[PDB]
Amino acid sequence: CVLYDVLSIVRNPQTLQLISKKKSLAGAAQILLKG
Amino acid sequence: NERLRALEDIEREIGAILQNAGTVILELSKEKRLLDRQAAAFTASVQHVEAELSAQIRYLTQVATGQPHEGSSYSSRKDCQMALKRVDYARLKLSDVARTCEQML
Amino acid sequence: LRTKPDPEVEEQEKQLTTDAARIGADAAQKQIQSLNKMCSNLLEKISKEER
């Protein structure tokens, strides 16, 4: 509903991506350990 | 025991380190120790396991129509157990004779 | 309806905006050349290379 509403209406030192990649790597390592 | 040993080896090598090799590239967290795990257990183990699986797949394929790999199916193994039964009957008879002898004392 | 409100990245980056000054910053952005090819040169030379 939010996507459809948006479609109808349209007509520095943060490193958030680094933290997200670190969390993804940690999750992948945890999944491998669980396997 | 050839096929049994082959199956045992395939089972022991089924759980290879390839599934656990997903944490080898992150080992470089000290400079721009166990970095060797990213070489031997990255893809070579999986390649060898796949090669072994393919080799095991391409066997003679003996079983075609009916019931092969038989081999008992038949005779005096039954009569072998029957001879064991005769041995038991002789044991019983010997025991009866021994009881009679003991009574004869 | 506001950018699908579910703060779990912006709030975390704001709460941990300062925890590493000059420790790394070398194995995070320049880590795209450590191990480039480790399995891409062994999957097309087993079965696809035969035909």
Q: Give the gap in angstroms from C-alpha A17 to the nearest C-alpha of chain B.
A: 16
Largest CA distance in chain C: 56
The closest alpha carbon to A29, from B36, B25, B103, C33, belongs to B25
Distance (Å) from the C-alpha of residue C1 to the closest C-alpha of chain A?
6
Angle at B11 between CA B21 and CA B16, to 5 degrees: 5
Chain B contact present for A19, CB below 8 A: no
Q: From residue C15, give the alpha-carbon distance in Å to each of A18, B16, C8, C35.
A: 15, 41, 11, 32
CA separation, residue B36 to residues A28, B26, B32, B47 (Å): 20, 12, 17, 17
Helix orientation angle between B2-12 and B44-57, rounded to the nearest 10 degrees? 150
Contacts of C25 (CB under 8 A, 6+ apart): none
The DSSP secondary structure of B37-96, one letter per residue, reads HHHHTTTHHHHHHHHHHHHHHSS-----SS--S---SSSTHHHHHHHHHHHHHHHHHHHH
Residue type for position A12:
N
Residues of chain C contacting residue A13, judged by C-beta atoms under 8 Å apart = 17-18
Quoted resolution (Å): 4.7
Residue B63 CB contacts under 8 Å (≥ 6 apart), including other chains: B69
Cβ–Cβ contact C34 with B under 8 A: yes
**Cα–Cα dist C6/C12, whole Å:** 12
Q: In terms of residues, how long is chain C?
A: 51
Report which of B27, B28, A26 is spatially closest to residue C26, judged by C-alpha positions: B28
Burial of B95 (0-12, 13-18, 19+ CB in 10 A): exposed
Q: Phi, psi at residue B74, to the nearest 5°?
A: -160, -150
What are the angstrom distances between the C-alpha of B30 and each of A22, B26, B61, C28?
A: 16, 10, 53, 12
| First and final C-alpha spacing in chain A | 37
Integer angstrom CA distances of residue B4 from B8, B10, B60, B86: 6, 10, 16, 37
CB atoms under 10 Å from CB of B6, counted, come to 13
The structure was resolved experimentally with cryo-EM
Measured distance CA(B46)–CA(B21) in Å, rounded: 11
